[PDB]
């Protein structure tokens, strides 16, 4: 994928495997991102030269395949390195792995055509204050203070799903803050694209998100090259006035393709079955999603660890490269609640300490101490009996059950899918209601009438009107 200017180069030499050892020019080699569009077979299969060598036979690696080529395929010289087509007009259809499309026509909105290799981390003109963000929820923003343009990690199992995060985040974050939230995908299934995409017809996000997934039918270089579309396409909207927000799928494609491709090329690397390029890609790619002066660059860090491997680079890179990591177990969703994200082990460093204010410190200390001190009064005391239940068991059980079952406010995910409203929860109701009325004051709200209420604002009228 480069701008060819001249179409010369030369012939080839060896073509065994994926090692593109074509003898192009003598003393006129290109750059690293400047690929040579060789005419192998019928299509123009380009190969990215990872390491140039003298004579002409350079160590190049192609994405797909040559579709049956001979030993002397003609190559072509290029000028502009990594010349793909992207821009801020990609929010309308599904994207591919080379700047084209995967759904309809139009190459995922053809607009600009600049360099595909965007800048990683920078300062000077970038925002170094690192401001906080607000998603507009009582169990996401009031329990975890996320930063504006950060790579917040994710953990846990099921419960929420992609429909709750995409449907709830495609309407509340899109209207509450100016910006285009895109997505990605490397290492998915071939059938999920025929079902999950249908969700785009149930929340109206296809016109505001660029689905760039590579599935898994290709190899490592043809499916793991989705980093140029997100960084090259997300930089056009975050550096213009809006705020880009990407979303990754997993780390099996980058870890397996990077470790297998970097370790299976005849060179030694890291230990424990890892490669030496994990610190450069994880450190350079993890620090690139930062706040700037023209817009915050946010990215959903949805990396998958290797079954809690502390000796490999998944726990060190995922736990040391990201910021807050929220976990969602089956206990919060098995009882019949809205939000499946529990309040335990789901906070940042500036959300429960003394680096915020009296609202976050009093709400985090009161909710954390009330939840941790009240979680043992209903589980460990059930094996004996309820005869020794005083004011702490009734007040902690009623306040913990009513606050835990009533704090899950519904967003805009069920407003155009199920029929339940709720709009968005504010920080004043969840921060000024869960620290006073959820401990030992106004004990008039039950368990059935307090459900489906927006933070603590809608729960006040439900105790006397229902």
């Amino acid at each position: 994928h480069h701008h060819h200017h001249g179409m010369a180069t030369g012939k080839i030499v060896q073509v065994i495997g994926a090692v593109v050892d074509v003898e192009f020019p003598q003393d006129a080699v290109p750059r690293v991102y400047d690929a040579l569009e060789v005419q192998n077979g019928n299509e123009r299969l380009v190969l990215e030269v990872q390491q140039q060598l003298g004579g002409g036979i350079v160590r190049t690696i192609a994405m797909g395949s040559s579709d049956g080529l001979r030993r002397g395929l003609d190559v072509k010289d290029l000028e502009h390195p990594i010349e793909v087509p992207v821009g801020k007009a990609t929010l309308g259809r599904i994207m591919n792995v080379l700047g084209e499309p995967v759904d309809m026509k139009g190459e995922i909105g053809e607009e600009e055509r600049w360099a595909i290799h965007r800048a990683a981390p920078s300062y000077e003109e970038l925002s170094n204050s690192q401001e906080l963000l607000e998603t507009g929820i009582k169990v996401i923003d009031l329990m975890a203070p996320f930063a504006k343009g950060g790579k917040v990690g994710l953990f846990g199992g099921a419960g929420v799903g992609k429909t709750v995060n995409m449907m709830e985040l495609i309407r509340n974050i899109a209207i509450e803050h100016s910006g285009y939230s895109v997505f990605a995908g490397v290492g998915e299934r071939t059938r999920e694209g025929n079902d999950f995409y249908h969700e785009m017809t149930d929340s109206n996000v296809i016109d505001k998100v660029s689905l760039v997934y590579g599935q898994m039918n290709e190899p490592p270089g043809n499916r793991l090259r989705v980093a140029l579309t997100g960084l090259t396409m997300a930089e056009k909207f975050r550096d213009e006035g809006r705020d880009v927000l990407l979303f990754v799928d997993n780390i099996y494609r980058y870890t397996l393709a990077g470790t297998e491709v970097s370790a299976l090329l005849g060179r030694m690397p890291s230990a424990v079955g890892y490669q030496p390029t994990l610190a450069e890609e994880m450190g350079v790619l993890q620090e690139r999603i930062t706040s700037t002066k023209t817009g915050s660059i946010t990215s959903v860090q949805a990396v998958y660890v290797p079954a809690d491997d502390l000796t490999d680079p998944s726990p060190a890179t995922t736990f040391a490269h990201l910021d807050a990591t929220v976990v969602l177990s089956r206990q919060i969703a098995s009882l019949g609640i809205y939000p499946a994200v529990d309040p335990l082990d789901s906070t940042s460093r500036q959300l429960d300490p003394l680096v915020v204010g009296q609202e976050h410190y009093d709400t985090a200390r009161g909710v954390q101490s009330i939840l941790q001190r009240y979680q043992e009064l209903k589980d460990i005391i059930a094996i004996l009996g309820m005869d020794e239940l005083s004011e702490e068991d009734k007040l902690v059980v009623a306040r913990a059950r009513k606050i835990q079952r009533f704090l899950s406010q519904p967003f805009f995910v069920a407003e155009v899918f199920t029929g339940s409203p709720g709009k968005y929860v504010s920080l004043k109701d969840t921060i000024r209601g869960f620290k006073g009325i959820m401990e030992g004051e106004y004990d008039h709200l039950p368990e059935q009438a307090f459900y489906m209420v927006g933070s603590i604002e809608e729960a006040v009228e439900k105790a006397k009107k229902l």
Partner: protein, 508 residues
């Protein structure tokens, strides 16, 4: 013409009587993004720096005939196979000088964000060696660490060598943020080598560390994720460039190091990419060089070493190099060659427990695992003679109280481990940005050592006794500040501390 060289093949195979390759320049044979073979260079020095295409000091690996392996700083994948180099004069030309304190300094020189103008003494050697045998005496001097137990128990002076390790996600890089504001000046120009930072760490650490204290005497050279071999693995070895202008002159020298093992992966390219030998997690013996003329050179000079290293300038004074290197342990991960060689090459070792550092307590130091090199040698009279038994409170209270949930340790004898055991161990802990000096050790060790402020002190009595006694005694008496001027442990400390503490604490 055995090898395909086009120009050199036809010229060398057709006219071998004229070589002319003694200019120590020429060009390069190939360029595989770092691993570039410099062609020629017969009269060039092995290991000397040379400016190639751009702005990078390319130094050769060895002098194996004319095929020397040059390593340019930065990525060389965009250039073609055949970069023309210049002459190889001499390497080791870093910015040496103690007068560049105050401005922003990076790992490449004296240009950083945003002050790129730092006046130094001159570009000289950076990898300094160790001292002598008889001309290497440790200077015992007092300093403030940040807490009462840290400065009163393990008082590390100027020129010591101890190992420090912190817990992960608990406080291994900040913790005591009142060290720069409470310590003011650390003798001379300070330094702090780090590997792995961004805009939030430099902006929050520079704004928080510079907004409270004096940041005009600290030249920290940190590095981000885009660091090469001379900016990541060579950060702890090139940090002793300006020390010769402070330690080898008459005064002292302050230095620090954070995240030393994290850069060890940067050495993997010298064991995996260079096709060398491996050992612990794909690493050769290069880390052993850190035990030679690198981390083992943190020693104070004597009286005879100040006259030879400075060419006659002090003549009577003694230099010091206080280089305290720390590391971020992964929940107590110190059982390899780096912990054994680093902890065994010096004379001190300290470990931080992850039990109380992540539960909300301010006491992150472990009890009994802290074995510093100085301790009571560099302390004063109020920290070594009167406060020398600091290990009996944590060892006796922790060992006597942690008896698998016991009943009572002889009832009254358990009062120092259950009743009043939290007023001298749990209450005397530095929290977020808590300054400490001689008033905490002298006032807490000269009045609360008998029964004036240590008997009836628990929760309400401990907080009200220390707050009312410290506020009334510190705001009513003016001679107590004199205890911060000299040593102590005399009749004035017992009479002034007992009379001021008893009279000021009897009506709380």
């Amino acid at each position: 013409n055995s090898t395909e060289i086009s120009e050199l093949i036809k010229q060398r195979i057709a006219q071998f009587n004229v070589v002319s390759e003694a200019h120590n320049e020429g060009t390069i044979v190939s360029v595989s993004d770092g691993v570039i073979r410099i062609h020629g260079l017969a009269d060039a020095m092995q290991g000397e720096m040379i400016s190639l295409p751009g702005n990078r000091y390319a130094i050769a690996l060895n002098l194996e005939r004319d095929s020397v392996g040059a390593v340019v700083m930065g990525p060389y994948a965009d250039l073609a196979e055949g970069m023309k180099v210049k002459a190889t004069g001499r390497i080791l030309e870093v910015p040496v000088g103690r007068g560049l304190l105050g401005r922003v300094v990076n790992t490449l020189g004296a240009p950083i964000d945003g002050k790129g103008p730092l006046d130094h003494d001159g570009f000289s050697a950076v990898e300094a060696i160790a001292p002598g045998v008889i001309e290497r005496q440790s200077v015992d001097q007092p300093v403030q660490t940040g807490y009462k137990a840290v400065d009163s128990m393990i008082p590390i002076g100027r020129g010591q060598r101890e190992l420090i390790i912190g817990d992960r996600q608990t406080g291994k890089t900040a913790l005591a943020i009142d060290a720069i504001i409470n310590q003011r000046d650390s003798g001379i120009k300070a330094i702090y080598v780090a590997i792995g930072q961004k805009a939030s760490t430099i902006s929050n650490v520079v704004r928080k560390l510079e907004e409270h204290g004096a940041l005009a005497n600290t030249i920290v050279v940190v590095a981000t994720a885009s660091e090469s071999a001379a900016l990541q693995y060579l950060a702890p070895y090139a940090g002793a460039a300006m020390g010769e202008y402070f330690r080898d002159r008459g005064e002292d020298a302050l230095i620090i190091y954070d995240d030393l093992s994290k850069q060890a992966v940067a050495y993997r390219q010298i064991s995996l990419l260079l096709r060398r030998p491996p050992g612990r997690e794909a690493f050769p013996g290069d880390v052993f060089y850190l035990h030679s003329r690198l981390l083992e050179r943190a020693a104070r000079v004597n009286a005879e070493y100040v006259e030879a290293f400075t060419k006659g300038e002090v003549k009577g004074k003694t230099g010091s190099l206080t280089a305290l290197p720390i590391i971020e342990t992964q929940a107590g991960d110190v059982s390899a060659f780096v912990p054994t060689n680093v902890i065994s090459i010096t004379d001190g070792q300290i470990f931080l427990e992850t039990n109380l550092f992540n539960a909300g307590i301010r006491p992150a130091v472990n009890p009994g695992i802290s074995v510093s090199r100085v301790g009571g040698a560099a302390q004063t009279k109020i920290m070594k003679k009167l406060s020398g038994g600091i290990r009996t409170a944590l060892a006796q209270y922790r060992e006597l109280a942690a008896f698998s949930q016991f009943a009572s340790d002889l009832d009254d004898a358990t009062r120092n481990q259950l009743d009043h055991g939290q007023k001298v161990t749990e209450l005397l802990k530095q929290k977020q940005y808590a300054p400490m000096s001689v008033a905490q050790q002298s006032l807490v060790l000269f009045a609360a050592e008998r029964g004036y402020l240590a008997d009836v002190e628990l929760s309400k009595i401990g907080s009200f006794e220390a707050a009312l006694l410290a506020y009334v005694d510190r705001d009513h008496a003016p001679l107590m500040q004199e205890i911060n001027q000299t040593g102590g442990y005399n009749d004035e400390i017992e009479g002034k501390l007992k009379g001021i503490l008893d009279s000021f604490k009897a009506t709380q």
